[PDB]
Subunit: 39 residues, 4 copies
């Protein structure tokens, strides 16, 4: 039936997931930006 | 009730999020491609 | 008509996808944390 | 009204997006795995 709130409920989880990814690539863009060399 | 536009409204946010991720891994695929060495 | 379960069905796939990404950036945050140098 | 197909239509785009991310971190997990050093 009304699974429409169910979507909003797991998509809110997907956003929670990218909230990890985002910060982790932010972290990677920092590390990969050059941790021991490069500019 | 009609949360269906609400989904479209936060999924548009998820896409906004990967628009960061995408470009940031693009950045990582560039950096990790070899910033100070490698090919 | 009722594509609402269809969304939940492909969004469950998107979550399955980030379950790869998440762990892979976890992996990257580890590797990029310094595999041969850096801290 | 029925934005429900609209969701499926942009979520199909989000999946298209992670299809980039997934492969790009795959790429990063490869590069970050050690391109010039490490194991």
């Amino acid at each position: 039936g009304s699974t429409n709130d169910n979507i909003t409920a797991r998509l809110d989880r997907i956003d929670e997931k990218l909230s990890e990814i985002l910060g982790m690539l932010h972290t990677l863009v920092v590390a990969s930006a050059g941790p021991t060399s490069a500019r």
